[PDB]
Amino acid sequence: EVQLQQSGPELVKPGASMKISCKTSGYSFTGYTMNWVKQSHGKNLEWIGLINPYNGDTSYNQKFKGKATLTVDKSSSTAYMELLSLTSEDSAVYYCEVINTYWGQGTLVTVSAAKTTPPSVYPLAPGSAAQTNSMVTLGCLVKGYFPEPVTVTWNSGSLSSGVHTFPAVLQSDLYTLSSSVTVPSSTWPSETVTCNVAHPASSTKVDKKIVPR
Amino acid sequence: EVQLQQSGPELVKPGASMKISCKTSGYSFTGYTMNWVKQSHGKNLEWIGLINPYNGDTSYNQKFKGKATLTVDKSSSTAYMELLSLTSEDSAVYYCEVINTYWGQGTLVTVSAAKTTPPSVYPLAPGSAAQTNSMVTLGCLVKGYFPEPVTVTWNSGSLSSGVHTFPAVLQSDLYTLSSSVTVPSSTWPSETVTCNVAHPASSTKVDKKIVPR
Amino acid sequence: QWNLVIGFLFLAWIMLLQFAYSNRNRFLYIIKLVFLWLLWPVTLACFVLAAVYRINWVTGGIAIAMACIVGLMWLSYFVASFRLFARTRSMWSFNPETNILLNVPLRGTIVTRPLMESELVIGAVIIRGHLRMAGHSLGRCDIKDLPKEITVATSRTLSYYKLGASQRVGTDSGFAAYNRYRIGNY
Amino acid sequence: QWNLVIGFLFLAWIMLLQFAYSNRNRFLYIIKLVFLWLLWPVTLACFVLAAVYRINWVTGGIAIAMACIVGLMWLSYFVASFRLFARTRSMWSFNPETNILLNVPLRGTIVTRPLMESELVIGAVIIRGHLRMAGHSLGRCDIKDLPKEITVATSRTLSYYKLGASQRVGTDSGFAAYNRYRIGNY
Amino acid sequence: DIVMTQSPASLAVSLGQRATISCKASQSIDYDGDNYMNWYQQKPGQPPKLLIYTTSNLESGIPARFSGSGSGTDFTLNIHPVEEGDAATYYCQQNNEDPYTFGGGTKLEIKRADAAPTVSIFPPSSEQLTSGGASVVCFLNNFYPKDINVKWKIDGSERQNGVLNSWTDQDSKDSTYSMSSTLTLTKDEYERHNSYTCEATHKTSTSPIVKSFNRNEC
Amino acid sequence: DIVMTQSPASLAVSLGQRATISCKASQSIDYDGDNYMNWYQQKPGQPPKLLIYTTSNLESGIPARFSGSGSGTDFTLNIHPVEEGDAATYYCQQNNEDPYTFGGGTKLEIKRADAAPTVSIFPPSSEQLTSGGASVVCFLNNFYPKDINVKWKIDGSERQNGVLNSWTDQDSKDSTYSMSSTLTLTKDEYERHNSYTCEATHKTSTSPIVKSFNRNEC
Ligand SMILES: C[C@H]1Cn2ncc(C(=O)Nc3cccc(C#N)c3)c2C(=O)N1c1ccc(C(F)(F)c2ccccc2)cc1
Ligand SMILES: C[C@H]1Cn2ncc(C(=O)Nc3cccc(C#N)c3)c2C(=O)N1c1ccc(C(F)(F)c2ccccc2)cc1
Incomplete structure (x- = not known):
């Protein structure tokens, strides 16, 4: 089983340089060629280049020459790409691939000088609405986070279905997200429902239980 | 794609000889080897011999040697097995195979000093059954034919679902076949149901309609 | 002596080490087979033509033992070649290289070539429309291969193979594998 | 005449026209490359000794054009083999047969051999745990094959292949195919 | 004249459970280290069809539920996810020697719920x-x-x-x-x-x- | 340096019906008679998955309902029994020339009966x-x-x-x-x-x- 585990999301200021690592496992290093791919706008695919694990021979496409550099660490079985002079158009998802069939998780790179802020969690319940029928909607709003990867989970993964999570939206350079779950009246307010909001970029985790009031 | 058509069943007396003719299609006749199998009474596979249609070079085992002659006609894409000095232990379902993947449909060889007899058809109807359930069962008894096989169907093959066919019982060297079909009670007496009995060995075709009695 | 005929010998040797080591052309490689076939009696005749002028004794008991060896092995292998001819009535059993043959039904007839391995799995590659099985160009074939080929070696080894897996690559080509499914003794 | 030194020549010819095809044994196939390598600057200097003597200019002038033939292909081929070296820093780029290489990752390192075809499909056969790709015996391998092998050229292109299909046969053996999926020109 | 035997005469297997058929040979075959054994299936009124060849090579068109294995003189056919359509007679064949021989044949029956006639x-x-x-x-x-x-x-x-x-x-x-x-x-x-x-x-x-x-x- | 395009930017196909997606290559790739073309599928939140390589070779593990073919400049991806799970974006790539360029994407939607929120x-x-x-x-x-x-x-x-x-x-x-x-x-x-x-x-x-x-x- 071939696996490629990447370092994870990163936030940098304009003009900065950074390194994206990719730790590979399940197969011998100094084997198959490593290829780098940049996905932009969430729609379009592109090609950066390739590097051979064994002889440090690299080939770049056209416009990434002097923009990105590739290297490897044989002892740690780790591939690296260095991004130089990052600008606002460089915010993207970067993937590592072996033979076009095995792909990494994707590293999200955000280029901005804005401050990172922790999220604020507000529960949503039909308080005093006398909604005791078969369609009870519970939800939550998370506001004021930055840059992107806030994960909202219901009851630590117990409510794996019936959940509608929406794409994030931006207001005044900050991000907001809304989510809901549909439950029967037999579980409300008879059972406690908790929203688990994780924001790694601020090292923040909030577990907030919905109070019917 | 690849077809191995057989010549059909035959009945002979002890000591007689015959020729099983297999006609192939779908591929160039030469280039693939030919194998013969006997499958004597019961369920026991056996190997008779192997021949090359292109140049001969036949091979037998030490038990069937002198009991059969295997030959080929390239002009009609046909292969032949000559059965010599047939006895009571030779009655079987002989057929050809090529590479352990494609088989003929089977040639039934019967060795007996017996007379071919046409079948007698007696339809079975639930007379005075006085049933109030939403099912009605009818059938047909086909008695006194020889040799096997006999093909018994309903409505010229249109009626197959709900049909139970039973192996023939051998009494006094004659076979008796039993067949029963269950149909909705709304089928009767409005619909026409017929039993079709075919015995090629006696050139006997019978079609009998069942009526309430 | 002349320093020109030696040059042509030394030049005909490169051409035999370069192009003769390929079976991918019918009417290019039977000539090499014939040359290697004819090299055998020439050596024995040369060696026996040194034991009659047995002067200095270096042309004596040395050109006699090797004459025995080279006249012994030649018969010991001609016997086997004729025995191979006996079973499979083909003129391919007289090649001076091997004693194993491979048969491929194609275009109505059967194409026979010499083989060197007699292994358990045989690979087949169709490139652009031409078949190349075992280091042998075998003519023209689309993906309409045979589900059974044979390999024959005198005294046993009537081995029947079988189309085990075939696949098609872009627009003209393909590959296939023949896994041995049957063995026959003589 | 000395008919003892001539039979020793024909015997060597029968010896090397029989065992020099197989690329299986490495320490038996590396010697043939050296011997074939030495035959060029021997023929070149064996045709020139007919310009030193120049007896009959209708027979001493032939070895001028002939010596101008093999003094001209020799440079225009060493030049190319050295470029095969220039890209791939290997010592297999100096065999006098072909100018294309095959790279197979095995047991940590890479196994490199010379290849003659550069087709679109490459076959691979594992017999008893030994891998055999294109006439070369590449060592020891279970069914732990590689999903990518590489064929290299002098300047032509780098051509990566892909494990398209594999099958295990008889608890040890197997067949596999590498259908070319990529092409890269330097 | 090489004899081969199958241990069970018949099997009664419920749906979803594993069925096993074993066979023993008097000879070790051992041709170049490779054993030979063919497994066949036959239904009433029809000629047999090949399921497994050379002791482990699944025939094309046969589902992966049929797994053949063994070595030496011991050979075994395993049908793990037995379904309602697996009701036939299974046979073995040597496919090694000039007097090619078959096995006796084992019948597979499928269990179900009781029902009145x-x-x-x-x-x-x-x-x-x-x-x-x-x-x-x-x-x-x-x-x-x-x-x-x-x-x-x-x-x-x-x-x-x-x-x-x-x-x-x-x-x-x-x-x-x-x-x-x-x-x-x-x-x-x-x-x-x-x-x-x-x-x-x-x-x-x-x-x-x-x-x-x-x-x-x- | 090479432009490659797909015409049907968006599709709407009901269950069981055929879907076709076309692609045109500007510079008529041909290496010794062989065209090169790769078809990919991507779902939200995941990296793309390879479907077809070298214009007709189906990637192992991909259902047989995906197929494709073409010549010279014109290539086509065909999905005959379109199911409800076939809601993704499809891409094309060269794998012939130095830049190994990607084409544009196309989005496949599934038709269904009307429903009120x-x-x-x-x-x-x-x-x-x-x-x-x-x-x-x-x-x-x-x-x-x-x-x-x-x-x-x-x-x-x-x-x-x-x-x-x-x-x-x-x-x-x-x-x-x-x-x-x-x-x-x-x-x-x-x-x-x-x-x-x-x-x-x-x-x-x-x-x-x-x-x-x-x-x-x-
Ligand atoms: C390797 C072996 C395999 N092998 N299988 C089959 C044959 C064969 O049919 N040979 C043959 C030769 C001539 C005429 C005909 C016909 N008709 C047939 C052969 C064969 O020739 N072999 C072989 C052995 C030895 C040598 C030697 F050159 F090395 C050698 C010779 C003699 C003394 C010392 C050294 C070279 C080649
Ligand atoms: C196979 C072909 C293509 N080819 N590709 C690569 C090479 C190669 O690396 N050769 C080489 C030779 C010597 C030293 C080195 C080094 N270092 C490298 C070769 C090559 O030599 N070829 C070739 C062509 C023709 C002939 C001839 F024998 F036909 C011939 C002889 C002389 C006059 C005329 C005709 C023989 C051989």
């Missing part, structure tokens, strides 16, 4: 009575287990004489059995008896199913 | 009001058509400022969509009007679905 009685037809003789036909449909005792009675007196019994193979869809019992009577001994009764005793009931008719009713 | 709303929370703000949030769930007109009418006045609308992708299980509409405001403006109303006009009826609450109701 449906009993239907048919009186003699007018044509047979006119010609001479009578045939009373009893049909038992869609039952499990196959072990049913069917008895005939003339005016209440049991008559085992003149009864033919034909059995079907296990159904390929419902995994049930069917049975036909026919009583043959002469033309003179039929008109002297008026009450005809058939009884079916099954393992699923303490009250056998009784059906009957009278000669003067039809 | 389930509408619910939520008033401001106590935490927001304690902080000093307010929000009213309306959810439309499990509707098929994408054309819904959502309105925020307070005492007959349509509020256009402070309304955000977020859409989900097509569900991979039932092909439905969902929508979230949020009205953001301050507490000083919230405590003016008594009745807050959210309306949704759909294309399956002439009666829009309306939900509302009073600030003094809770």
